[PDB]
Amino acid sequence: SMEQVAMELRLTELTRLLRSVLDQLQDKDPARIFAQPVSLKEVPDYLDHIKHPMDFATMRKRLEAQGYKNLHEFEEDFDLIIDNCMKYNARDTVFYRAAVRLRDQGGVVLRQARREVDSIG
């Protein structure tokens, strides 16, 4: 149907906007602490602690399958990255501190992304 195609074009356009959001968020992690999933070879107990692991590569795979239907879904995944790190790691670690910084810096990017998604429909 033409309606199905128009909906598909909206999803494609959201995907393009989310890709730019994702790149901007990931620049706020220059140490690449959150680039890849936590290794279960190197942290074998990780899943006893963290029930829903997340990282920027896993988000990028979802994104390219047009797997985010809306900004809310994308933000949920970004929040997992931060929230998981702040539970597993103590306050006085480079990991926790990197999460705090990513959160604070990402807020700015997410604030405007929300206005753009609302604005462009």
Curated annotation (Swiss-Prot):
Residues of the full protein shown: 555 to 674 of 1058
Record cross-link Glycyl lysine isopeptide (Lys-Gly) (interchain with G-Cter in SUMO2), residues: K41
Domain (Bromo): residue spans on this chain: 9-113
Protein name: Bromodomain-containing protein 1
Known function: Scaffold subunit of various histone acetyltransferase (HAT) complexes, such as the MOZ/MORF and HBO1 complexes, that acts as a regulator of hematopoiesis. Plays a key role in HBO1 complex by directing KAT7/HBO1 specificity towards histone H3 'Lys-14' acetylation (H3K14ac), thereby promoting erythroid differentiation.
Subcellular location: Nucleus; Chromosome
Signal peptide: none
Protein's gene: BRD1
Tissue: Highly expressed in testis.
Organism: Homo sapiens (Human)
